[PDB]
Amino acid sequence: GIRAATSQEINELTYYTTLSANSYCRTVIPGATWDCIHCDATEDLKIIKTWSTLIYDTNAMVARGDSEKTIYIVFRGSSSIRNWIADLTFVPVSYPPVSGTKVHKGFLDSYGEVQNELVATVLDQFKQYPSYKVAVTGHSLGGATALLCALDLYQREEGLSSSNLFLYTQGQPRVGNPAFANYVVSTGIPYRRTVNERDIVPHLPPAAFGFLHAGSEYWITDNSPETVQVCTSDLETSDCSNSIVPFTSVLDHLSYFGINTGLCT
Amino acid sequence: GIRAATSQEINELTYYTTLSANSYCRTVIPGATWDCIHCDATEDLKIIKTWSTLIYDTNAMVARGDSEKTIYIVFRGSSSIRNWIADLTFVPVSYPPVSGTKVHKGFLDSYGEVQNELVATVLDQFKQYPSYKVAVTGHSLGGATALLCALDLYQREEGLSSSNLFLYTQGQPRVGNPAFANYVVSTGIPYRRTVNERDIVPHLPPAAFGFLHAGSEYWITDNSPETVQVCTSDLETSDCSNSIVPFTSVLDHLSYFGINTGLCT
């Protein structure tokens, strides 16, 4: 382209895723460780470181491983618130590194814170280681951161790259622118892315514113078994895632594969 | 345109857522018762128835318440696978018723288965118652368915428507284409758617393829416290868621415010 893956890758992827887852956881972161658941796986590785941162927171870681080787880184893513616121822131721114580228711112710131430390650680580780590778991874935111871281690482340069580194892532867312893416691619690194398935874251942121893415892727688718696817390419695419848418867831997210891523568981 | 828411528405837315957551748861568905956681718241218422368916498954438831018166328805968403596948488926276718337208386818287927128975138952228741118223618511896927348923228732114629128725738813895725857415626116128824923151688923588926858516837315953114834113326118746118894317886541999704948604826791 596418492719597927393978297984491985797935595983790787897963691882890464786881780581892423783981881271877231715391333990690881932171714591770281490983522980847881897964861781183981891772553981091983180581860681190282871781971171967281413060412101943103961121977381892451790284670781490483080785075984593986590787390183790783991671881251985571877211948881817281712161882261868421851152895421837321874216615105873117630128880235820175490159130139152109851118891225967214927161893432870146976251890464830155962481880155540196881481890177450183890584580187350281790587350185140480270197080888290783690285890877880164883671996741979201973680993835874104891781991627850124890777780138840173790559850148830185250191070494690383591609290869190693890687890345992964897962878921894632885217871151830135394219360119850145491218650158891343370139760087390469690897890456992967893853895413888861548905996920848512890746887618875121847216692219348219611117944114874218880158890476690769892966895616896954478924778981078982697982498946894844891847595519491849890187860047972114459519295929794967874217395618478915718318538807877417857240848961797926967281886781891845298974594992858861874021938381841891 | 844117524115823122117031517180018441837231518461118512828451318631528805728771228812858705628751548904887823188972126890318631288925178982238914218421138981758871938341438921318580628712428881018261018554438831018646528831448814678941087978194939696708678807678932748813328715328731118523018274016291318140118222118635318621528821648805748831996824868881398963188936638803897833448905867712896936877418493619667318155509638606147927118317012519042208367408748506896617698955848712438607778833528612257718448841538607117738538822428506128847428612127617128856318413127748128885117548017065018462128714418412438706748821967631996702648931827411777618528731737416467718418412437418258926427215256608147927128876018475228823726017017034018463318512638706618511948551996350858612877318468914367818544118035319358816436218137618648814135319128717017226118421528605518411728611867514948551880132979410893824718503865215887915894517637219481119075609787717767318428607318713218213618511857314837531933151938681714391828671815141838512628414834117317113118805348808778808860118512112618221778418723116952131891418880133885215798934987681856221698942838851718503716181618661967781897816698962338951």
Position A243, amino acid = S
Among residues B19, B253, B80, B205, the alpha carbon closest in space to that of A140 is found at B253
What is the distance between the alpha carbons of residues A60 and A116, in angstroms, rounded to a whole number? 12
For Cα atoms A139, A144, A149, give the angle at the middle one, nearest 5 degrees. Answer: 110
* Residues in contact with B253: Cβ distance below 8 Å, sequence separation at least 6, in sequence order: A253, B140, B199
Task: Give me the torsion for CA of A136, A139, A144, A146, rounded to 10°.
Answer: -10
What is the distance between the alpha carbons of residues B199 and A199, in angstroms, rounded to a whole number? 9
DSSP code for B140: -
**Residue B239 annotated as binding site:** no
The experimental method is X-ray
Q: How far is CA A184 from CA A72, A138, A161, in A?
A: 20, 17, 12
What is the distance between the alpha carbons of residues A216 and A199, in angstroms, rounded to a whole number? 17
Active site residue B253: yes
> Which residue bears the tokens 């748813």?
B60
> Which residue bears the tokens 């295929």?
A239
Active site residue A253: yes
What is the distance between the alpha carbons of residues B140 and A253, in angstroms, rounded to a whole number? 14
* Residues in contact with A140: Cβ distance below 8 Å, sequence separation at least 6, in sequence order: A253
> Which residue bears the tokens 């228812």?
B19
Burial of B199 (0-12, 13-18, 19+ CB in 10 A): exposed
For Cα atoms A78, A79, A84, give the angle at the middle one, nearest 5 degrees. Answer: 50
Active-site position among A131, A249, A253, A255: A253
What is the token pair recorded at A46?
Answer: 């180581």
What is the token pair recorded at A258?
Answer: 């298974």
Among residues B63, B139, B2, B199, the alpha carbon closest in space to that of A253 is found at B199
Provide the terminal-to-terminal Cα distance of chain A, rounded to the nearest Å.
36
What is the token pair recorded at B128?
Answer: 């128885």
DSSP code for A140: -
Active-site position among A80, A140, A162, A186: A140
Is there a contact between B253 and A140 (Cβ–Cβ < 8 Å)? no
Active-site position among B140, B161, B243, B249: B140
What is the distance between the alpha carbons of residues A199 and A253, in angstroms, rounded to a whole number? 5
At what resolution in Å was this solved?
A: 3.0
How many C-beta atoms lie closer than 10 Å to residue B140's C-beta? 2
Q: Chain centroid to CA B225: how far? A: 24
Active-site position among A40, A44, A109, A199: A199
Q: How far is CA A241 from CA A7, A54, B81, B143, B211, in A?
A: 20, 35, 19, 22, 15
Task: Give me the torsion for CA of A176, A179, A180, A183, rounded to 10°.
Answer: 160
